[PDB]
Amino acid sequence: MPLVALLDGRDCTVEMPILKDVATVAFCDAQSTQEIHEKVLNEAVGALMYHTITLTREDLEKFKALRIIVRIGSGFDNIDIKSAGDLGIAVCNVPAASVEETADSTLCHILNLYRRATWLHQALREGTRVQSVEQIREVASGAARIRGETLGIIGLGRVGQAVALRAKAFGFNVLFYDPYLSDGVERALGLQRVSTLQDLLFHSDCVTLHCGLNEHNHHLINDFTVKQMRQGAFLVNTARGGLVDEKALAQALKEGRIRGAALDVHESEPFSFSQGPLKDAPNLICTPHAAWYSEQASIEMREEAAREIRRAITGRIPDSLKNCVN
Numbered sequence: 001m002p003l004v005a006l007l008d009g010r011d012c013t014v015e016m017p018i019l020k021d022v023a024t025v026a027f028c029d030a031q032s033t034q035e036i037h038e039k040v041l042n043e044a045v046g047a048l049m050y051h052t053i054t055l056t057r058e059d060l061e062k063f064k065a066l067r068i069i070v071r072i073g074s075g076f077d078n079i080d081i082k083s084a085g086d087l088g089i090a091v092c093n094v095p096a097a098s099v100e101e102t103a104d105s106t107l108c109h110i111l112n113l114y115r116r117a118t119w120l121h122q123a124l125r126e127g128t129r130v131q132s133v134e135q136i137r138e139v140a141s142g143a144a145r146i147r148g149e150t151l152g153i154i155g156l157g158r159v160g161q162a163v164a165l166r167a168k169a170f171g172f173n174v175l176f177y178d179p180y181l182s183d184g185v186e187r188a189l190g191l192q193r194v195s196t197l198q199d200l201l202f203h204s205d206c207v208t209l210h211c212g213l214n215e216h217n218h219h220l221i222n223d224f225t226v227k228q229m230r231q232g233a234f235l236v237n238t239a240r241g242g243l244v245d246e247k248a249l250a251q252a253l254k255e256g257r258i259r260g261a262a263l264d265v266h267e268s269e270p271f272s273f274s275q276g277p278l279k280d281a282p283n284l285i286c287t288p289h290a291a292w293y294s295e296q297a298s299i300e301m302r303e304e305a306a307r308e309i310r311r312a313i314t315g316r317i318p319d320s321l322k323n324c325v326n
């Protein structure tokens, strides 16, 4: 049978029953290309991969039989799909499984910044004693009233729309910037749309990123862009690290130009509070790229990825594929 390999993973239990009579399945548990055994490079007809490994043109050229790559997730910026397309390699993803999980994690981070739950809990872990009202106000200093605040969403796709709908219920004003959507999309949803990134940053009290990382938005938030944000604004990023210049963010947090930030993604992952530009940045909440996760979402995307692999080997590429992103 054809060989299909899980590149940056070791567990294939969910995929096995779906691919049993279709392909030989093997895993590499690789963090890089040089960790992928020769057999895979030479014979692999298909590959399943998460977001922890990157495939450049050089890497893709090492596979000699590879005809399809399936990202067990939605973002495929860790792959050079254009070169994959040149090498005759179809690339697909699983766009729907974690939409709600990610939007809910986004709202969690937004609420943690406004309500300071994570920081208040920590203050308590460190032994802070809050006996009087004066003490309560001091320890919770910065906790804000949400109603009336403007939430600026950058990228109104699947997650952006889910966040917008949830945000409305807390009394947030929502605004969004998304240069690729057709006009009128904002009407059906009852949201306000702005024409440029600068307008969105200028009017938002809390900015949330929900765009895919592409060739035109690397470091969308940088030293120039950060200066266009309101004083004391919050930044939330559960989209892609690299959309944000950590150096510009660190300074901003240190200078107080940005009151706080919540990041589930970072320029360099895995993330560490002892390494990088955010080394000793104040008011920073971080999570290990886990916004997408729930037991149900994980199983859902893995079985969908498995089926897509099955369609590619049993059917016709790219005709039989449901989510090829070319």
Ligand SMILES: NC(=O)c1ccc[n+]([C@@H]2O[C@H](COP(=O)([O-])OP(=O)(O)OC[C@H]3O[C@@H](n4cnc5c(N)ncnc54)[C@H](O)[C@@H]3O)[C@@H](O)[C@H]2O)c1
Pocket (backbone or CB within 6 Å): 074, 075, 076, 095, 098, 099, 102, 154, 155, 156, 157, 158, 159, 160, 177, 178, 179, 180, 181, 210, 211, 212, 213, 214, 216, 217, 220, 238, 239, 240, 264, 265, 289, 290, 291, 292, 293
């Ligand atoms: N950290 C996580 O766990 C996790 C899980 C799922 C998705 N994500 C990420 O969240 C993002 C949104 O995914 P969806 O929500 O699933 O993706 P999507 O493809 O449905 O929507 C992305 C939206 O961004 C818009 N966009 C692209 N470039 C833009 C720019 N420069 N400015 C404004 N808008 C821009 C697109 O037109 C599109 O509407 C992606 O980057 C995805 O990789 C992260």
